[PDB]
Design a protein around this ligand. Structure first.
Ligand SMILES: *[C@@H]1O[C@H](CO)[C@@H](O)[C@H](O)[C@H]1NC(C)=O
Ligand SMILES: *[C@@H]1O[C@H](CO)[C@@H](O)[C@H](O)[C@H]1NC(C)=O
Lengths: 78, 50, 99
């Protein structure tokens, strides 16, 4: 059996969602991570930081019901 | 294409019971008296079958 | 029995702290709400459903645990196929003695 074994763990600061002009942004797949400078979105099994855009996330509700939500910005390409 | 394949499987078999007294000593009183001290073996067989 | 209890305690602690990753390899820490969000996402429900109804889901979890606790304090036959093993072993040895 040929299998894939992940290794070389690293700690990041994480959040469930980000608030941006009164809306809650949840990731499509992946997690929001903070590495000391800015917030990125990444896959769970490999570390590959990506810019939080409108394509990565989706909107559901306003930011006063989710526990642990933070303020940040979402880059719209247009 | 859309295909349909059949697969057959057994689920149960026949439930059976035996009566030691008639199999070993059929309608004989002397044989039943001699068999009277083998009763643990027959209750063991009946428990297995049930 | 203490060794088996220690094994089950280790399994429950690893599930509550690391999640699903300690079976594939080294354990990865993750807060429990995010693990619940991934489990919700795995069955086809978006994670905002978890993150907006967290109080209700937590209360239902606690209520279900209490019902499991109350069911096992009343005399019943829930563990009746574990009793059959010890009954069969004892009956076989006593049959050998009586034969
Ligand atoms: C965090 O990630 C960004 C990605 O470009 C990088 O520029 C920055 O140096 C990283 N910060 C630390 C502390 O590693
Ligand atoms: C930033 O977050 C804090 C606490 O979550 C909140 O009180 C504040 O209103 C947020 N900023 C804006 C501009 O809404």
């Amino acid at each position: 059996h040929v299998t894939y074994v992940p290794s070389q763990e690293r700690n990041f600061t994480t959040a469930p969602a980000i608030c941006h002009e009164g809306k809650a942004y949840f990731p499509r797949e992946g997690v929001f991570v903070f590495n000391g400078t800015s917030w990125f979105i990444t896959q769970r099994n490999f570390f590959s930081p990506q810019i939080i855009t409108t394509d990565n996330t989706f909107v559901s509700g306003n930011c006063d019901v989710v526990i642990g939500i933070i303020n940040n910005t979402v880059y719209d390409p247009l | 294409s859309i295909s349909i394949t059949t697969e057959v499987m057994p689920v149960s078999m026949a439930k059976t019971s035996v009566d030691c007294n008639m199999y070993i000593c059929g309608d004989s009183t002397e044989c039943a008296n001699l068999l009277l001290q083998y009763g643990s073996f027959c209750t063991q067989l009946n428990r297995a079958l049930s | 029995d203490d060794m088996i209890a220690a094994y089950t305690a280790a399994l429950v602690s690893g599930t509550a702290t690391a999640g699903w990753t300690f079976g594939a390899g080294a354990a990865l820490q993750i807060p429990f709400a995010m693990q619940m969000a991934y489990r919700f996402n795995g069955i086809g429900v978006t994670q905002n459903v978890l993150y907006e109804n967290q109080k209700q889901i937590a209360n239902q979890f606690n209520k279900a645990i209490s019902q499991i606790q109350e069911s096992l304090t009343t005399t019943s036959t829930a563990l009746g196929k574990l009793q059959d093993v010890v009954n069969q072993n004892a009956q076989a040895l006593n049959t050998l003695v009586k034969q």
